[PDB]
Amino acid sequence: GTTYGMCTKKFSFAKNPADTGHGTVVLELQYTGVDGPCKIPISIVASLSDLTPIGRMVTANPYVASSEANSKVLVEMEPPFGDSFIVVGRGDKQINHHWHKA
Amino acid sequence: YGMCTKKFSFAKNPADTGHGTVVLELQYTGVDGPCKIPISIVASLSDLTPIGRMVTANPYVASSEANSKVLVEMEPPFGDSFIVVGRGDKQINHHWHKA
């Protein structure tokens, strides 16, 4: 079927975020789980204490495409001016990467 | 990271989600990744102006590694439309109907 949940397992940053030539950043994620297809819990936040989404996901609503473990997904994003964190996963699964834009 | 240059294929029959969208599993054997997938919804093969909405907006082939699969979700208009992936002699298409 096509009833997909949020991915339940940890991701890793397979390649750390890098700037494009059009004012965005791209980040390669690797998914450790086998519950794909599943929706990636990714957002950009002001701090780890307030996970209100800010910034802009350019690759919006990305999915892990497969139940195969260690699948990779590339996400393009536009962090806000100033400080933010890219956060993937929730609770004890959460990984984070700080970003500063001047 | 420009547009992917090679022809894609669909891994399975395009699937109605029930909530008015279509999910496609795109396969790619090119080695020019990471690259942006040239996918859109159009009214007809004669007018490729994008219509509808990309739910999975701006999807990419994730790296230079061949043999990947990318899940794309799109909201076509009600009625007839075409899913189109690729350009020119690389273009593939699928006629979609939404009721």
DSSP labels, B37-94: --EEEEEETTEEEEESEESS-S-EE-SS-SSEEEEEEEEPPSEEEEEEES-GGG-EEE
Q: Which of B16, B62, B65 faces A73 most closely, judged by CB atoms?
A: B62
Residue A92 three-state SS: helix
Total tally of structural domains belonging to chain A: 1
Cα of A2 vs its chain's centroid, Å: 21
Residue B21 three-state SS: coil
Contact B38, B67 (CB under 8 A): no
Cα dihedral B26→B29→B33→B35 (10° resolution): -40
Domain that holds residue B86: 1-99
H helix or E strand, kind and range, residue B23: strand B22-28
Q: Resolution to 1 decimal, in Å? A: 1.2
Contact B98, B51 (CB under 8 A): no
Q: Which residues in chain B are closer than 8 Å to A76, comparing Cβ atoms?
A: 58, 60
End-to-end CA distance of chain B: 37
